[PDB]
């Protein structure tokens, strides 16, 4: 038993090299705003490796060298299970509050749900603010620096900002100003953070 | 040669479980806007695994089962080397244009470099626009939906937007409007995309 163990070790080296390549590709280009295809690919790997990670930990727990590695394996298994269930709970609450597919993006925790002309456009947010500004700039609405389409000063008198846990802020139109062109200033100030979901 | 190969296989199973845990943690929480510590940790793993990935590929190339896997290993090694050198070239050009540490973030490709009161504040951008709006909202500048500090209508008459390859847009103040409060509308329109770097 000399050469076949070396051959399988070389196969495992090639396999771990391939997984390292996938890791590097996911960490370098797989992002929502960089490559949607690679973003979906990263989501698929996360969703399929969570149960595989749990199974690997329980397999490394059933076998052991001593009763030290077994406890560590149990701790890792329960930690990743807690993270898994917490992510599903947060995503399910998010998708119960809004109706967008951005609820499953780990990169984003705050989401906007502005409907422009009957379609609820969803854009990510970085911080929760009392008042959110909005400019038109010749008929190109840019709420929170997000291009949403073509509109003028006659906007929607309501906005909702969802978060991972509670925090369903409700906004309304206010402070409408016009210029010589087709631009504007009308912002949205929050007035209620209750009445969760829809 | 029966039991020691099984023991080392169990050790490798535990090791691959730990690496899977690190992969899941990096893909679930390690983001610039989610956890700065985990973002730096992910950057460190990327920077240390790029040469390790190259070394693993050249090691899997020097050994082979036949002259088929060697060519694949060479192709993977040269591909990851090209990606590595391209990332360094892009980051070095970015850090030669601006003077911010955001140049090494794979999540961001467009960066803003607005100096407010002598300090060049750097904020990420999603798209390159001809005109960028800016609101004040009671003394809280929000250029491109990025809170920068406390200021009023008397802003900086210049902005620069850097990109990965060339595209050093220069902006200037324009369309300044005031309201009854301490808010504003003054935006920035691009007038030059030349004179790269500083």
């Amino acid at each position, epitope marked *: 038993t000399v050469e076949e163990l070396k051959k399988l070790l070389e196969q495992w080296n090639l396999v771990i090299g391939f997984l390292f390549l996938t890791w590097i590709c996911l960490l370098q280009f797989a992002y929502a705003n960089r490559n949607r295809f690679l973003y979906i690919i990263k989501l698929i790997f996360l969703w399929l490796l969570w149960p595989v990670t749990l199974a690997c930990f329980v397999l490394a727990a059933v076998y052991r060298i001593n009763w030290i590695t077994g406890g560590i394996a149990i701790a890792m298994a329960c930690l990743v299970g807690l993270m898994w269930l917490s992510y599903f709970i947060a995503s399910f609450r998010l998708f119960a509050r809004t109706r967008s597919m951005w609820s499953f993006n780990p990169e984003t925790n705050i989401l906007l749900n502005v409907p422009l002309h009957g379609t609820i456009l969803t854009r990510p947010l970085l911080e929760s603010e009392l008042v959110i500004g909005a400019v038109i700039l010749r008929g190109h609405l840019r709420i929170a620096g997000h291009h949403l389409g073509r509109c003028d000063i006659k906007d929607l008198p309501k906005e909702i900002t969802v978060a991972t846990s509670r925090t369903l802020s409700y906004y309304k139109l206010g402070a409408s100003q016009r210029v010589a062109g087709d631009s504007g200033f009308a*912002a949205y*100030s929050r*007035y209620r953070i209750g009445n969760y979901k829809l | 040669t029966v039991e020691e190969l099984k023991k080392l296989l169990e050790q490798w199973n535990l090791v691959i479980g730990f690496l899977f845990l690190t992969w899941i943690c990096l893909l679930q929480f390690a983001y610039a806007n989610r956890n700065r510590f985990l973002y730096i940790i992910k950057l460190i793993f990327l920077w240390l695994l790029w040469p390790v990935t190259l070394a693993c590929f050249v090691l899997a190339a020097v050994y082979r089962i036949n002259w088929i896997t060697g060519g694949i290993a060479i192709a993977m090694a040269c591909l990851v080397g090209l990606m590595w050198l391209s990332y360094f070239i892009a980051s070095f050009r970015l850090f030669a244009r601006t003077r911010s540490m955001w140049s090494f973030n794979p999540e961001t490709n467009i960066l803003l470099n607005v100096p407010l009161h002598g300090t060049i504040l750097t904020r990420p951008l999603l798209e390159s626009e001809l005109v960028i709006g800016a609101v004040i909202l009671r003394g809280h500048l929000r250029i491109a939906g990025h809170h920068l500090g406390r200021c009023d209508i008397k802003d900086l008459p210049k902005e620069i937007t850097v990109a990965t390859s060339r595209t050093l847009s220069y902006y200037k103040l324009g369309a300044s409007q005031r309201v*009854a409060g301490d*808010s504003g509308f003054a935006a920035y329109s691009r007038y030059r995309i030349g004179n790269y770097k500083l």
Partner: antibody
Amino acid sequence: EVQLQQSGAELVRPGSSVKISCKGSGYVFSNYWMNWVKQRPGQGLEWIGQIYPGDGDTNYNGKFKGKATLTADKSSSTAYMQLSSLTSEDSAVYFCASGYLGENYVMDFWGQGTSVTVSS
Amino acid sequence: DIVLTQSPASLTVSLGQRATISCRASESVDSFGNSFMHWYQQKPGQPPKLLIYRASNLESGIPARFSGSGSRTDFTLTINPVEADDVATYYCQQSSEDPYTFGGGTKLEIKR
């Protein structure tokens, strides 16, 4: 320059009803909230309720729920408050306030005040 | 309903000194990431004038002599220079819950 102008003085017999007026100029009246703060001549301020003319949504305090009715008209750019079942306790001065940005939790600019006397 | 209490009910200060007004609260006032605490100044015959909003921000058009303090249980309005035009009644208001309860009111007096 935003401003708020109310009516003059109201003198109604007990048991009757009064309708106080508050209008604004220099801003979009339909996108701004009201506060309708009540202040007794001897006591301090007392919040009553809010109203949004854009959609007619009205919030109340609970003590004035039913005593005060908040109505607004977008065409005339005027907000109204109806006070029914008036007694001697209701004799107070009412102020309507709004924010610069149209918010509801901040009162920036107020009105000159409307004094209401309930006596025979 | 938050029961706001002000202490003292009446305060007298010499011209040139500083004034300190404290507004107690029944329960926690700070909301999720915000305070929603306001201070108003009302002269006799005039509507209340907002001085400090969110307990830490100066209102536009108000002199910089007014400042706020406290966090989530107490809020203090401080006037370092006091002038002859600073005589009024100061109120404290909370805007974190539906009932916008006001303070008891503090009448400021000048010792001359």
